[PDB]
Amino acid sequence: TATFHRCAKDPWRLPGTYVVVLKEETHLSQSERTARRLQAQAARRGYLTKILHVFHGLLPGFLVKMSGDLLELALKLPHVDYIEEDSSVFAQGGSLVEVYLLDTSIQSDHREIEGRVMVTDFENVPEEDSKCDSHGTHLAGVVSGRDAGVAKGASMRSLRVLNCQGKGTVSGTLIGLEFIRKSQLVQPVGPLVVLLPLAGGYSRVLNAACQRLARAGVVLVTAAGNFRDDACLYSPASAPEVITVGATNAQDQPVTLGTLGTNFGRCVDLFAPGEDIIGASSDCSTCFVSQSGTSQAAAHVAGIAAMMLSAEPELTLAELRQRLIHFSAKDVINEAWFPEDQRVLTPNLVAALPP
Amino acid sequence: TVFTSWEEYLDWV
Amino acid sequence: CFIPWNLQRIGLLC
Ligand SMILES: [Ca+2]
């Protein structure tokens, strides 16, 4: 029957907030009723509950702020597939394509991206424990920047899911991916590229939403993560039908980020430039800064995909992935940087545009 | 280092 | 002409 899951990274868990995921074909009316039933049953037991959101489109279910004491009861509700405790996520040509970015707030009026980025009204960020938009402005510059961008012809839509300290939530990200799906149904356009330059621990629900969006025909590009670890233990990096990007440097070496660095393993699809990446600084309207990480690496691939899909708009996700792999530089990465058993498992590929 | 312009970055690099 | 290493690496020209 129905199961409970919470982040395996104890400091990244957010107790007291739960994502109740219902069976695939559960209707929104059934979902709203299940949430009301939960509030009623909890009230009977002396518990105060609050329904924060009701999902529909990608995943059926709701978000509830309640005591964990209520989970045995919540698991017994009808249509419940699984429940997941909320957890933290952290910041880590092309003209026919819309590039969606789920990140920090962005400085839209930056000369590098002015006119190329449409700041949506979406914001779902956890409270905080030039700086607020450093991560997002740089990445938007990497994707479509005037002087230093990959896909200058690409237009972008930005959603805020990371706060001023680059911290978000799984729930926040789910609502953002649902918002993208809703925006597309209301006002369909061409091929969609969704950039996720963030990571948390393995999330069954975040992976599920990512697979639903992927089956719906959306292309999802993510950071492999900066934990010098196997990407399969991180989300949305572990979601199989996503394009999970690792970071390489100018010397064909996997990137070192402090005492850590790029993630690796059978979940990474390929690597891309993620060290000393010049791009837009949000310090001033014409400022540029060098930044590093799998986020930067992912932004390059989001640019290469945005261009491949604009040149060949009918490519399926499966076909686009084979194109990305076919056009990558092969066996240039120093495998000796990776742990021994991870070498045969880690794709030795550096992203590249068709010549 | 934060460059105040693209030209500033080009002279530096 | 100068081109940042990362844009050169992925096949962009200037
Ligand atoms: Ca994949």
Domains contained in chain A, number: 2
Q: Please name the amino acid found at residue A224.
A: A
How many beta carbons lie within 10 A of that of residue A301, not counting itself? 30
Domain end residue (candidates: A35, A54, A86): A86
Asked if A87 and A6 count as a contact pair (C-beta separation under 8 A), the reply is: yes
CA A156 to ligand 1 centroid distance, Å: 23
Q: A130 with A258, same domain? A: yes
Greatest extent of chain A over all pairs of C-alpha atoms, in Å: 67
Q: A242 with A106, same domain? A: yes
Smallest Cα distance from C8 to chain A, Å:
9
Show Cβ contacts of residue A52 under 8 Å, excluding neighbours closer than 6 positions: A17, A62, A63, A64, A65, A171
Q: Is residue A168 part of a domain?
A: yes
Q: A74 with A100, same domain? A: no
Residue C7, classed as helix, strand or coil, is helix
Say how far apart CA A112 and CA A131 lie, in whole Å. 17
Q: Is residue A22 part of a domain?
A: yes
Resolution in angstroms comes to 2.4
Q: A208 with A167, same domain? A: yes
Say how far apart CA A210 and CA A286 lie, in whole Å. 35
The boundaries of the domain holding residue A36 are 3-86
Q: A50 with A178, same domain? A: no
Output DSSP code: residue A232.
Answer: G
**Burial annotation A113-141 (CB, 10 A radius, 16+ → b, else e):** beebbebbebebbbeeeeebbbbbbbbbb
Domain end residue (candidates: A48, A71, A86): A86
Say which CATH number the domain at A291 has.
Answer: 3.40.50.200
Asked if A5 and A54 count as a contact pair (C-beta separation under 8 A), the reply is: no
Domain end residue (candidates: A69, A86, A103): A86
Q: What are phi and psi of A231, to 5 degrees?
A: -65, -20
Q: A258 with A116, same domain? A: yes
**Beta strands A349-350; A50-55: pairing state:** unpaired
Say how far apart CA A343 and CA A336 lie, in whole Å. 8
Experimental method: X-ray
Say how far apart CA B12 and CA A205 lie, in whole Å. 46
**Is there a cis peptide before residue A240, judged by omega within 30 degrees of 0?**
no
Give me the residue label for tokens 């395996």: A8
Q: What are phi and psi of A72, to 5 degrees?
A: -65, -40
Q: A125 with A70, same domain? A: no
Written in H, E and C, the secondary structure of A241-258 is CCEEEEEECCCCCECEEC
Catalogue the active-site residues of A.
103, 135, 295
Interface size B-C, in CB pairs within 8 Å, comes to 3
